[PDB]
Design a protein that fits this description.
- The structure is cut from a larger assembly and holds one copy of chain A (460 residues), two copies of chain B, one copy of chain C (284 residues), one copy of chain D (66 residues) and one copy of chain F (351 residues).
- By secondary structure, chain A is mostly helical.
- Chain A has 21 helices and five strands.
- Helix content of chain A is 48%, strand content 3%.
- In chain A, the strands form two sheets. A two-stranded antiparallel ribbon of chain A has the order 1-2. A two-stranded antiparallel sheet of chain A has the order 4-5.
- In chain A, helix 9 packs across helix 11 and helix 16 packs across helix 19.
- Chain B is mostly helical and 153 residues long.
- Chain F is of the alpha/beta class and 351 residues long.
- Chain F is built from ten helices and nine strands.
- In chain F, helix 3 packs parallel to helix 4.
- Chain F is globular, with a radius of gyration of 24 Å.
- The chains are: A mainly alpha (460), B mainly alpha (153), C alpha/beta (284), D alpha+beta (66), F alpha/beta (351).
- Chains in contact: A-B, A-C, A-D, B-C, B-E, B-F, C-F.
- Chains B and C meet through helix 1 and helix 2 of B and helix 1, helix 2, helix 3 and helix 8 of C.
- The complex binds zinc ion (ZN) (4 copies).
- The site of one zinc ion has 8 residues of chain F, from helix 9.
Chain lengths: 460, 153, 284, 66, 47, 351
């Protein structure tokens, strides 16, 4: 995941404030920050005066300081605030545009942008054009992955996929195949897929007539809530209107026909930020249609099905004869070796199975779950909540094809005496952060938690 | 005032509400920055005080010895507070009381020796560890003295 | 982690007048109402779209405000619907006021309010088995005079406490009125892991609210903000009325009695006692 | 604050020596060799290191799988 | 079968119980071997 | 079609204090295969549940646990008021496996010995979870039963899948003759509810007995943290309670003061008692066609009332089970919840 939040902080500060002028964008980005930062920001928003950092330290206690650093580093990186070495101290305060926009949003501000929606006869039916948006999303997914017939006419969308290198397909020969990007597209279920596509449209649509402030205004206004009336008609910039038409083509806009009307708020824009339920001629009833198969016997038992879904399953398992409720497929080392040929790591698939194919594995994941977390301290043996056997077999296939070991962290030095090194090693063993250590070299390559805690203890 | 003025004020408020109003912008925010500050002061004061609740002795051998002394004095006082309540075995109570006074003096000498040898900080820790039991036995002694004076005088 | 903050605002027009009587009449409950609306919106925004609920306690009963029982049969705009609906309901309730309303001043239905709110929490939690709701309710009371401590509600309050603890539902309380520490409420917040706030009258609470009435959803690594000690030296003697320390509690009656036994038939259950037992007590 | 970042590699010393050989063949991208069991490398070229490792192991073993 | 005076006089039983717990024998001796308590009442607590 | 208790006819007295001595059964019989793991494992699991429950609802009582292995009764938890000790003891047992024959007589005698210190106002009890179909006694049994009933010791037993004559005699004997206490089970859920109904205090129609005022005092929490110091376990504990009279620290409990030996409680225990003394009238199920009341809930706001004329559906019933004294409706969920968890009737509180 490119972690669009990282792209957000990527952009410079002045354009960040340019975006913060739009209160709805302020709210939407408030939705994204880690909870610690959320709470701290909500504290600061009202008392119109900077605050010393010492208070914001003493606010948090023990065994939870890691999140303090997470929040402060994130917020500084995206520069929502302005640290102030006023008297040599730290006089924190938000980018005041952010503060005022947010406060306006909380109590009836002047955000005509966020208020761009119009209330009228929302003749849009729940299934009404919702099925059409779902069908468009399925069509583009199939065309990108490659179906027997790809009716994907998104010439702009195809150009974005190709130039963006969305999938390892020979666009010169017209191929739309799964690359590392294609593997990720197979991985990111909904939010991941929509996010990758939005980032691709951003990167491709970045040359001329961008108006990035208007771009994000339109995007978040779409994700915020149903603008409905007068959206497409009134509430859009010129380039904003063009981007809206393009998104509506991309499915992310459920604009009605007649090419001129209010905004058509498809559920997809909601899906962009919701991180919630995923379900979308005139028939389609399934809260658990996807009937995948995955047990301890490493077999594929399917009753429920979805053609693109089962094709995704086939992307790492053989197909011989499609059946009524089943499809001939058995997951083996060869089955995942198919994706290993694409170099697909046995990592995304883990959480994928934990999440996807569950419409047919609800009872399976419940019996594996068994609520064996509160019962874990008492009964020390887990009831295969997340199947470890399958994980071990997958790791074995991955190991069979790999043979290389790597570690994260950074090399450390200036352990002048053996006493500091030994005490830090003991503390790390207490906290389980030392990958490896040696007093002879006074060096190691681990996470920064031990150094952080020692420095905090020393300075304060 | 009740009844009349009650309904009066009630209606006044009802109106004020109905009188558009409810300016959540005007909702205090904090109004007086000073008032705000004062509220924060109160709250940080309380946070500090309740935080003072951090939910390890030095001389392990003296610690165990003091623990033995505490157990001893505890059971001794146990027997008194049984007997001093219950009742005709007065002489048994007398023996218990004399022994308890002896134990109190013993612990006093113990504290003296601790202050002499372990110094002050360790002696301070010992005194802290033994404060509750010491207070209880002292109170028992005082209560017996009061009861004995009452019976005698 | 969604939370169901179910405020319980009591509004006694008697106590509303007392609030006007207290200090000056420099502003009716309107201040409290507006601050409550804002705080409610704040919580409604904070989490991932977690419901709320509000109940009242007028002089002759209680009635819901927000969930808006079947009647026909801006900013995110759901804030809009919640707030406008609440205010319409509350104005309707204020229409429900007259002399016959002035009549039944004998009681104060706060206990009914808390109990019903807890029932509501149970309803919502039970229906929403998926995505378990870390719920927790609130209490706003206009502290008035004319009764130093009404006690005829003592038991149902504690039953509320025990229900809360079993249901794992912290219950925070904000008393606005005279410097009379609402003992039962104080024990309620302290026991059920809550927070007590005895504000002065006319300050715009919104700061107090958003500070110390927003940290109870599903956090609890954070020091609560309770006032001075919460002594559990409990109820005064039923016969006497002076707070007891070394109690003297009868029997199956369970009433707590002072050092003054009437010698027979503890004055809450007709149970004559063993005069031998009476003498045994008198053996001191 | 001293934190020397890189691609830390830890394995058996024989595989470490083989990795050093390969790395020298591909112009010594290994930043440091912390000990007989740890290596500090630049993550830029570790991927092609693994690629060439796969190539040479396929060349040698060939997986008869008889 | 079991009586207060009976357990009081069950000296062999009492010494067996002394053998029962190190903590027990320790506290007992330091209440006794320290010129402290007659065992009678000491058990009168522990009946 | 209803399954309700008609009326409660001892809503005047219960044993509020208790000293219940649960006695399990760990003997070769309990190793048969009728309950899912066995008899024994399921038994001990439910025993843990019952321990938690009972020490909740009767938070002022004590309890002791007794097994019956190899014809011997080996006490596995002294009679004590701290649930955690008993919980741990049961944990330990559950990993150990039964043997020998159940010696009901020995267990009975051990109990009768065990409950002697319990004072007169406290009430005694035993709860035999008898699993087998035999005993093995080293003495006369009717001798023991007579001694028991002489010592005013009610006994309730929960046989497994049979009825044993002697046990029936035992229950009928100690409980003042009135036989209702030998309930035996026919299903696991029946077993859960068996323990549940064992939790509550036990009235039948109490003979006029001595009723006695009991001295006790309440503690006040402590403040300091570093001054950690304890007088009931002789440790350092960051802060606890003070006996109002003995005036010595005591680690958190409703326990008895270990210095001056008087009972300690806060009140909430007394509140639980109050809840048990005077319960509510069982909520009535309103007539299907004669109700004509509000179409909602009252405590909650449910939309489950009727359907208005639907051949058989409306002919079924009208979910309006409504309490008497307040005469307000309540949906089934609300009534179940009120009568199970919180006993303040919503409407009946408000008037
Ligand atoms: Zn203790
Ligand atoms: Zn005491
Ligand atoms: Zn209901
Ligand atoms: Zn009722």
């Amino acid at each position: 995941k490119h972690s669009v939040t990282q792209y957000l902080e990527e952009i410079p500060q002045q354009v960040q404030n340019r975006l913060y002028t739009s209160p709805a964008t302020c709210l939407a980005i408030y939705r994204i920050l880690p909870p610690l930062a959320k709470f701290f920001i909500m504290a600061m928003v009202f008392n119109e005066n900077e605050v010393p950092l010492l208070d914001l330290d003493k606010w948090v206690n023990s065994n939870g300081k890691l999140q303090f650093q997470n929040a402060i580093k994130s917020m500084k990186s995206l520069h929502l605030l302005i640290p102030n070495k006023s008297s040599g101290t730290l006089m924190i305060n938000l980018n005041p545009t952010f503060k005022i926009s947010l406060r306006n949003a909380l109590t009836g501000g002047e955000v005509q942008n966020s208020f761009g929606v119009v209330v009228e006869e929302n003749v849009v039916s729940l299934d009404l054009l919702d099925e059409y948006s779902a069908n468009k999303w399925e069509t583009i997914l199939h065309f990108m992955v490659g179906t027997p017939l790809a009716k994907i006419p998104s010439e702009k969308v195809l150009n974005l996929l190709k130039h963006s290198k969305l999938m390892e397909e020979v666009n010169s020969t017209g191929e739309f195949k799964i690359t590392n990007e294609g593997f990720q597209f197979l991985l990111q279920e909904i939010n991941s897929q929509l996010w990758t596509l939005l980032l691709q449209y951003l990167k491709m649509i970045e040359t001329s007539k961008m108006d990035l402030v208007d771009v994000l205004h339109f995007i978040f206004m779409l994700g915020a809530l149903e603008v409905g009336k007068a959206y497409k008609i009134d509430a859009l910039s010129e380039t904003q209107r063009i981007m809206l038409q393009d998104m509506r083509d991309y499915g992310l806009v459920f604009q009605k026909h007649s090419n001129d009307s209010i905004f058509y708020p498809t559920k997809l824009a909601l899906m962009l930020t919701s991180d919630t339920k995923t379900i979308r001629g005139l028939k389609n009833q399934d809260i658990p249609d996807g009937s995948l198969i995955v047990e301890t016997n490493f077999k594929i038992y399917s009753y429920s099905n979805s053609p693109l879904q089962i094709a995704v399953l086939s992307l790492f398992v053989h197909l011989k004869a499609r059946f009524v409720n089943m499809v001939l497929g058995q997951i083996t080392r060869e089955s995942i070796r198919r994706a290993l040929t694409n170099g697909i790591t046995a990592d995304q698939i883990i959480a994928y199975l934990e999440t996807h194919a569950h419409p047919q594995m609800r009872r399976l994941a419940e019996e594996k779950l068994e609520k064996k977390l509160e019962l874990d301290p008492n009964c020390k043996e887990p009831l295969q909540v997340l199947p470890p056997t399958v994980v071990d077999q997958i790791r074995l296939w991955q190991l069979e094809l790999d043979r290389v070991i790597t570690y994260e962290g950074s090399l450390y030095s200036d352990f002048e005496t053996s006493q500091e090194y030994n005490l830090l090693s003991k503390y790390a063993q207490d906290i389980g952060v030392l990958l490896w250590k040696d007093d002879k070299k006074k060096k190691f390559f681990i996470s920064k938690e031990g150094n952080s805690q020692v420095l905090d203890f020393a300075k304060r | 005032s009740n009844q009349q003025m009650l309904q009066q004020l009630s209606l006044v408020m009802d109106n004020l509400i109905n009188k558009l109003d409810l300016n959540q912008v005007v909702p205090n925010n904090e109004v007086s920055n000073k008032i705000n500050k004062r509220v924060i002061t109160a709250i940080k004061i309380n946070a500090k005080q309740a935080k003072h609740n951090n939910v390890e002795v030095k001389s392990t051998l003296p610690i165990d010895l003091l623990e033995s002394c505490r157990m001893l004095h505890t059971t001794c006082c146990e027997f008194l507070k049984h007997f001093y309540i219950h009742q005709k075995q007065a002489s048994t109570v007398k023996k218990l009381y004399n022994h308890l006074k002896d134990c109190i003096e013993k612990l006093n000498e113990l504290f003296q020796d601790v202050l002499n040898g372990d110094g002050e900080s360790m002696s301070n820790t010992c005194t802290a560890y033994l404060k509750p039991v010491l207070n209880s036995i002292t109170l028992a002694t005082h209560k017996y003295d009061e009861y004995f004076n009452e019976y005698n005088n | 982690s969604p939370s169901l903050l179910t405020v319980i605002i009591e509004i006694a027009p008697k106590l509303w007048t007392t609030f006007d009587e207290e200090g000056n009449e420099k502003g009716s409950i309107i201040k409290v109402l507006e601050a409550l609306i804002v705080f409610l919106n704040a919580h409604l925004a904070f989490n991932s779209a977690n419901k709320v609920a509000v109940i009242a306690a007028y002089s002759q009963g209680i009635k819901y405000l927000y969930p808006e029982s079947t009647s026909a049969l801006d900013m995110y705009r759901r804030f809009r619907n919640v707030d406008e609906t609440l205010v319409e309901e509350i104005y309707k309730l204020f229409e429900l006021e007259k002399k016959q309303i002035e009549q039944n001043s004998q009681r104060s239905t706060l206990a009914g309010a808390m109990s019903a709110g807890l029932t509501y929490v149970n309803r919502i939690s039970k229906e929403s088995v998926t995505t378990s709701l870390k719920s927790r309710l609130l209490v706003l009371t206009c502290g008035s005079g004319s009764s130093k401590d009404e006690i005829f509600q003592y038991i149902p309050i504690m039953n509320c406490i025990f229900s809360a603890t079993k249901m794992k539902c912290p219950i925070d309380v904000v008393k606005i009125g005279g410097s009379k520490e609402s003992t039962f409420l104080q024990q309620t917040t302290d026991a059920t892991n809550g927070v007590y706030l005895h504000v002065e009258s006319t300050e715009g609470l919104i700061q107090y609210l958003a500070t110390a009435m927003f940290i109870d959803p599903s956090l609890r690594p954070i020091i609560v903000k309770p006032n001075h000690g919460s002594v559990d030296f409990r109820t005064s003697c039923y016969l006497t009325g002076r707070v007891v320390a070394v109690g003297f509690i009868c029997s199956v009656c369970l009433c707590v009695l002072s050092i003054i036994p009437p010698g027979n038939k503890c004055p809450a259950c007709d149970s004559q006692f063993d005069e031998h037992v009476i003498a045994k007590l008198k053996r001191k | 604050a001293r934190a020397r970042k890189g691609a830390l590699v830890q394995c058996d010393p024989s595989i470490k020596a083989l990795i050093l050989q390969i790395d020298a063949k591909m112009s010594d991208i290994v930043l440091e060799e912390l000990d007989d069991t740890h290596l500090l490398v630049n993550p830029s070229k570790v991927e092609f290191v693994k690629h060439e490792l796969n190539r040479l192991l396929s060349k040698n073993i060939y997986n008869p799988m008889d | 079968s079991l009586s207060k005076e009976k357990l009081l006089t069950n000296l062999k039983l009492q010494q067996s119980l002394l053998k029962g717990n190190k903590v027990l024998m320790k506290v007992f001796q330091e209440t006794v071997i320290n010129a402290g308590l007659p065992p009678s009442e000491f058990w009168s607590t522990r009946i | 079609k209803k399954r309700t208790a008609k009326k409660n006819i001892t809503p005047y007295q219960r044993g509020i204090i208790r000293s219940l001595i649960l006695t399990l059964d760990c003997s070769e019989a309990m190793l048969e295969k009728d309950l899912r793991p066995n008899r024994h494992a399921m038994i001990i699991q439910y025993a843990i549940d019952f321990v938690h429950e009972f020490f909740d609802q009767n938070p002022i009582s004590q309890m002791g646990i007794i097994i019956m292995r190899n014809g011997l009764a080996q006490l596995v938890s002294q009679v004590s008021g701290n649930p955690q000790d008993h919980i741990d003891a049961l944990k330990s047992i559950r990993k150990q496996e039964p043997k020998g024959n159940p010696s009901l007589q020995n267990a009975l005698e051990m109990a009768r010995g065990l409950l002697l210190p319990v004072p007169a106002h406290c009430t005694r009890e035993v709860l035999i979870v008898f699993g087998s179909l035999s005993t093995t006694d080293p003495g006369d049994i009717h001798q023991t039963i007579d001694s028991l009933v002489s010592e005013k010791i009610r006994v309730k037993v929960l046989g497994l899948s049979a009825q044993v004559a002697i046990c029936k005699e035992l229950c009928k004997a100690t409980n003042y003759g009135d036989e209702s206490f030998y309930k035996i089970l026919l299903d696991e859920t029946h077993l859960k509810e068996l323990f549940n109904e064992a939790v509550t205090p036990l009235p039948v129609n109490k003979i006029n007995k001595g009723f006695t005022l009991v001295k006790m005092g309440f503690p006040t929490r402590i403040f300091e943290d570093t001054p950690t110091f304890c007088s009931c376990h002789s440790k350092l504990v960051y802060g606890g309670y003070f006996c109002p009279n003995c005036h010595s620290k005591v680690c958190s409990l409703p326990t008895v003061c270990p210095c001056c030996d008087l009972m300690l409680i806060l009140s909430t225990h007394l509140a639980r008692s109050y809840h048990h003394l005077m319960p509510l009238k069982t909520f009535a199920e309103v007539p299907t066609t004669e109700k004509f009341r509000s179409e909602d809930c009252f405590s909650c706001q449910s939309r489950f009332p009727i359907l208005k004329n639907h051949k058989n559906g409306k002919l079924l019933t009208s979910s309006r089970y409504r309490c008497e004294d307040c005469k307000q409706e309540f949906c089934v969920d609300c009534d179940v919840f009120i009568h199970e968890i919180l006993h303040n009737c919503p409407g009946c509180e408000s008037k």
